[PDB]
Design a protein around this nucleic acid. Structure first.
Lengths: 189, 143, 192, 19, 139, 72, 144, 61
RNA sequence: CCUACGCCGGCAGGCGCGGGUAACCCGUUGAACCCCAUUCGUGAUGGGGAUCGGGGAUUGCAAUUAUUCCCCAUGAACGA
């Protein structure tokens, strides 16, 4: 059968939000051995909704300048991070990943509508795919800026931030910026 | 590791406070006149394992290090790791360390001032010596 | 909100930021004919960490600084300033009695009045509230010089129109205007 | 046999290059 | 008694020579664990772990690899092993099990059996490469 | 300010490193390094000593990421 | 089933072939073993006190991987990334004299043979030895 | 209250740069109250949004 | 003049010895990142190597205002 990294299970994984249920593809036939797919997924529109979730966490992690082709460092960071979450929790860390992406994406968002000089924003609804991508970008960004100058390996930082956002801490930068956009959403309306 | 009980938290080798807890192959670099490659080729003939630190040592190791370090030809640090190959006076293949390092830099500058050469007046004025393209530089430290 | 402790520190500690803010503050003081060659009392509007306010102290001026950012003010605390720092939103008004200050200066700050994020009055209302109160808190014949970054010519015209309606006269000085990398707009005004 | 295989591989490579 | 096929990414060519054998898989004389980009081993192990090694029972599989880079060569070996098993069962065994294993591979990933449609293209004059061009100045 | 972590062991440092470490749910040289003011070199050599102590399982082992695990 | 050196983990084979050359003990060892880098394109000294031994082992194995490669090709294999200060990095090659005299020292053990073909290749003694130690590390692989 | 809601369409790209995609909205509370709202980012036909509230709607006329 | 190979050079380089007036000979054009182990452990530190002091070797009529390359020592600014 098919298990992540030779060992990790995918049939235990459950989606909570119906609003995000299709736009993460992890459960049945989008489980693969590695995040390294090396096929096109930005071919046309919405084809990066049917790419695997851990591939998205991988390909959004070479984001910074000096790392910008080095995907193998990224997949070992993913492997060490899943092992660290599997130690600190014990459960299947993919469930922690899904619960972290679900609990982190915004729900209302502010958009400047007017003219170039009328900054009179209007808090509108968040599209589900952009909620997915905004969540992945916040988790990677919290893994970045909390691992700039430390002793911690960036796999440890990603794993701990994924844990903290999976439970909705006041410690996750992702949950901090989600709460910030949700509070700005209260202001503009 | 272990807990070495003779641990001098301050080292004093050749008029220099050395942070003795630092790695031995990188705490000798801290003084002037010794870099990284040079202290390594010292330690390969100074017969101390790199695994240890700089505060884990015996003074017998310290005195044999300073012995090799002031006698660089007699202990097979041959004549290209040296700080000065052919001096103006004696031409002696010899290492020159911190106080003597500033002394011999000062010596060469005083000489080239006394020589009245193209270098010496640059060094008295404190400008670039190696013919640089200062059409956009010369920023920090000029007034 | 825009700044935090990390970013306020990185801005105030950057040598390139220090040099440019110092040059623009000294240029604003040269354009300020009312303090130029005179002692004066001053209000520094959008004072930040006090980089502009230190340079007011250099010419012997006594000053009050207004800023909306706590972290910019907290970084100013450790810089041995002689001015009074006040946590304040300039778009709600200038909270001094009539005729308090000889002059006012602002470096890199009033373009934020075109922004509609912080409060639920229109930028147009906040801009009027700023200029009308600013005219009042100034002495008669007092001066205001503001270096600012407009996004477009409509923002420049709106700022000019609001200052004009509040009773200010004067104009716009544009230094180095053929380089839109290095060009700087200075609003130079006087009260009645 | 090995030699033959190698030759075949080479040929394939050449073809690819041409393409 | 033998089938001779290939696999082709950007520059990587993977020559596959298979016949009736013993389950032997040589990649120029080395196994499928001895390739130093080793995490991609699992991608390199995708023809075996998806199909089961009992279907690779009595087949000699020789792999000779040319050109490319390491990741491109790994996907070329993956490509060539999958096409080699499919071509072997087509030429020497039924159509039905070949079609079945084709449907196992493609519905998992089409890139296993089909080629990649894109390469590092040539250059039309005016820049570093094809798309981005040189930079200028104003004022 | 200064992250000049302790380069060598101490009394109480080893009184926590021999003791508190097999009760963590996750034994990482960055974590052990981070909780008790220890350089990653020192904690890295100490965790290879904890291989030599035999208390603690070794799960992953790489260039710069070597994962240890408390037992049972 | 004559085992192949190519069918083993190569760097565990390098470490064991280094230990095998350590246990041998007979070789003309030069005197700049404790002085030099590998070439210009590195910065610091190597940490290995036996770096000559393991480089000789890896050089014998690279001779095993292809015959027809001279010292210049042995220079060219052991290349790397010279950092040119603030000017960008380039590829820079190995050191001629060191790799030449490693080949000379192992030539002393009748493990490196000069041919008619100009280069140097492995002796039949050498391939016998490498297949013996290959079976040693192969038993260290498929039976550990 | 939190309201999940079905997407029917994509009418246009309202805004100043083509940035608010226009979405007819069915509810998932089986009510036929089909309010047309504005979203930011890509939505295809048949998606499902999380409307924070149903009172504040997008602009008719 | 592109080089292979050998010898002598701790490192730049010399000396002998062929092919190549050219998909052939350099050439299978044997690269870098990458990877796997080691050491370092968040500070101006081994990051950054500038800024210089001694030499050494080539290019050439001619290197002084450092031609270039190499070997010690120097280690500023720089905290995104």
């Amino acid at each position: 059968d098919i298990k992540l990294f030779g060992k990790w299970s995918t049939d235990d994984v459950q989606i909570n939000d119906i609003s995000l249920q299709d736009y993460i593809a992890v459960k049945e036939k989008y489980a693969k051995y590695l995040p390294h797919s090396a096929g096109r997924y930005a071919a046309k529109r919405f084809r990066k909704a049917q790419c695997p979730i851990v591939e998205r966490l991988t390909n959004s992690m070479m984001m910074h300048g000096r790392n910008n082709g080095k995907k193998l460092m990224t997949v070992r960071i993913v492997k060490h991070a899943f092992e660290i979450i599997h130690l600190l929790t014990g459960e299947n860390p993919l469930q922690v990943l899904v619960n972290a992406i679900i609990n982190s994406g915004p729900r209302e968002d502010s958009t400047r509508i007017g003219r170039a000089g009328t900054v009179r924003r209007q808090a509108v609804d968040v599209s589900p795919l952009r909620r997915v991508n905004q969540a992945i970008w916040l988790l990677c960004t919290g893994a970045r800026e909390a691992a700039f100058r430390n002793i911690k390996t960036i796999a440890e930082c990603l794993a701990d931030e994924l844990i903290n956002a999976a439970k909705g801490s006041s410690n996750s930068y992702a949950i901090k910026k989600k709460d910030e956009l949700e509070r700005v959403a209260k202001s503009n309306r | 590791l272990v807990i070495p009980e003779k641990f001098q938290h301050i080292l004093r080798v050749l008029n220099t406070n050395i942070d003795g807890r630092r790695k031995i192959a990188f705490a000798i670099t801290a003084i002037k006149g010794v870099g990284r490659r040079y202290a390594h080729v010292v330690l390969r003939k100074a017969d101390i394992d790199l695994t240890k630190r700089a505060g884990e040592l015996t003074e017998d190791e310290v005195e044999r290090v300073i012995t090799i370090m002031q006698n660089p030809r007699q202990y097979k640090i041959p004549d290209w790791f040296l700080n000065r190959q052919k001096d103006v006076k004696d031409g002696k293949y010899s290492q020159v360390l911190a106080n003597g390092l500033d002394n011999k830099l000062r010596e060469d500058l005083e000489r080239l001032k006394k020589i009245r050469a193209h270098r010496g007046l640059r060094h008295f004025w404190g400008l670039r010596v190696r013919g640089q393209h200062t059409k956009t530089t010369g920023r920090r430290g000029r007034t | 909100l825009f700044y935090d402790e990390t970013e306020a520190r990185k801005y105030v500690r950057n040598s390139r930021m220090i040099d440019i803010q110092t040059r623009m503050a000294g240029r604003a003081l040269e354009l300020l004919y009312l303090p130029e060659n005179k002692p004066c009392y001053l209000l520094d509007i959008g004072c930040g960490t006090g980089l502009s306010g230190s340079y007011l102290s250099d010419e012997g001026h006594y000053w009050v600084g207004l800023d909306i950012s706590p972290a910019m003010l907290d970084e100013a605390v450790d810089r041995e300033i002689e001015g009074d720092l006040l946590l304040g939103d300039m778009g709600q008004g200038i909270p001094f009695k009539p005729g308090t200050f000889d002059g006012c200066i602002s470096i890199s700050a009033v373009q934020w009045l075109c922004n509609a994020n912080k409060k639920s009055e229109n930028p147009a209302k906040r801009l009027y509230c700023f200029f009308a109160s600013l005219f009042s808190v100034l002495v008669r014949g007092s001066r205001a010089v503001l270096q600012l970054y407009p996004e477009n010519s409509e923002q420049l015209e709106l700022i000019t129109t609001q200052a004009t309606k509040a009773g200010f006269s004067g104009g716009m000085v544009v230094d180095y205007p053929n380089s839109a990398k290095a060009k700087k707009f200075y609003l130079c005004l006087f009260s009645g | 046999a090995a030699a033959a295989a190698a030759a075949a591989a080479a040929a394939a490579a050449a073809a690819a290059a041409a393409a | 008694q033998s089938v001779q096929v290939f696999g082709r990414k950007k520059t990587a060519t993977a020559v596959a020579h298979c016949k009736r054998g013993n389950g032997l898989i040589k990649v120029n004389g080395r196994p499928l664990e001895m390739i130093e980009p080793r995490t991609l081993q699992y991608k390199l192990l995708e023809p075996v772990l998806l199909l089961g090694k009992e279907r690779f029972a009595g087949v000699d599989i020789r792999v000779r690899v040319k050109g490319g880079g390491h990741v491109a060569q790994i996907y070329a070996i993956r490509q060539s092993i999958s096409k080699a098993l499919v071509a072997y069962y087509q030429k020497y065994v039924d159509e039905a099990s070949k079609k079945e294993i084709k449907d196992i591979l493609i519905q998992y990933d089409r890139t296993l059996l089909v080629a990649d449609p894109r390469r590092c293209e040539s250059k039309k004059f005016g820049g570093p490469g094809a798309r981005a061009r040189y930079q200028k100045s104003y004022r | 300010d200064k992250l000049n972590n302790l380069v060598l062991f101490d009394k109480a440092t080893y009184d926590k490193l021999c003791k508190e470490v097999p009760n963590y749910k996750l034994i990482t040289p960055a974590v052990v390094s981070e909780r008790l003011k220890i350089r990653g070199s020192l904690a890295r050599a100490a965790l290879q000593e904890l291989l030599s102590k035999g208390l603690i399982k070794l799960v992953s082992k790489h260039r710069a990421q070597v994962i240890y695990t408390r037992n049972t | 089933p004559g085992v192949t050196v190519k069918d083993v983990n190569q760097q565990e084979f390098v470490r064991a072939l280094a230990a095998f050359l350590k246990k041998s003990g007979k070789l003309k060892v030069p005197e700049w073993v404790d002085t030099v880098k590998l070439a210009k394109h590195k910065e610091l000294a190597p940490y290995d006190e036996n770096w000559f031994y393991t480089r000789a082992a890896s050089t014998a194995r690279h001779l095993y991987l292809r015959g027809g490669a001279g010292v210049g090709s042995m220079t060219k294999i052991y290349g790397g990334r010279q950092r040119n200060g603030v000017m960008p990095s380039h590829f820079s090659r190995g050191s001629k004299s060191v790799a030449r005299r490693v080949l000379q020292a192992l030539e002393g053990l009748k493990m490196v043979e000069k041919d008619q073909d100009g280069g140097r290749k492995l002796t039949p003694q050498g391939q016998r030895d490498l297949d013996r130690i290959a079976g040693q590390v192969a038993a260290a692989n498929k039976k550990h | 209250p939190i309201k999940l809601a079905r997407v029917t369409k994509v009418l246009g790209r309202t805004g100043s740069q083509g940035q608010c995609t226009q979405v007819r909205v069915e509810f998932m509370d089986d009510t036929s109250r089909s309010i047309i709202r504005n979203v930011k980012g890509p939505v295809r036909e048949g998606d499902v949004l999380t409307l924070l509230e149903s009172e504040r709607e997008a602009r008719r006329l």
